Design a protein around this ligand. Structure first.
Ligand SMILES: [Cu+]
Length: 122
């Protein structure tokens, strides 16, 4: 009931797709950042929302800026998120798998960078 994911200096996640076993009551993502660039210039976060909500999350996050991890505080669209990390740093996030609803489309993404993928219940 976890997955390790990396974001690198070339604005790439190392996976495009996360699957969550329905046996899991909670799920944990462990984000890391191979490379050499620091947070203030190539910081990554890992953020989960519905596909429909992603654009607003990104837009409001960019408006909120670096010190708020490029996320709007208390954004109710955000199901789960990590903090922003620079190279060598790590953050994990855990969420309640019962927040994932039947028939909904979930996406994960970094807010400052064009990096995204799908999250699916197995
Ligand atoms: Cu990023």
């Amino acid at each position: 009931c976890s997955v390790d994911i990396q974001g690198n200096d070339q604005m790439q996640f190392n996976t495009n797709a996360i699957t969550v076993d329905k046996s899991c009551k909670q799920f944990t993502v462990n984000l890391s950042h191979p490379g050499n660039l620091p947070k203030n210039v190539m910081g990554h976060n890992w953020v989960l929302s519905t596909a429909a909500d992603m654009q607003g999350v990104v837009t409001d996050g960019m408006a909120s800026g670096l010190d708020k991890d490029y996320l709007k505080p208390d954004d109710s669209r955000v199901i789960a998120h990590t903090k922003l990390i620079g190279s060598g740093e790590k953050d994990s996030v855990t969420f309640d798998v019962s927040k994932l609803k039947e028939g909904e489309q979930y996406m994960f993404f970094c807010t400052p960078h064009p990096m995204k993928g799908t999250l699916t219940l197995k």
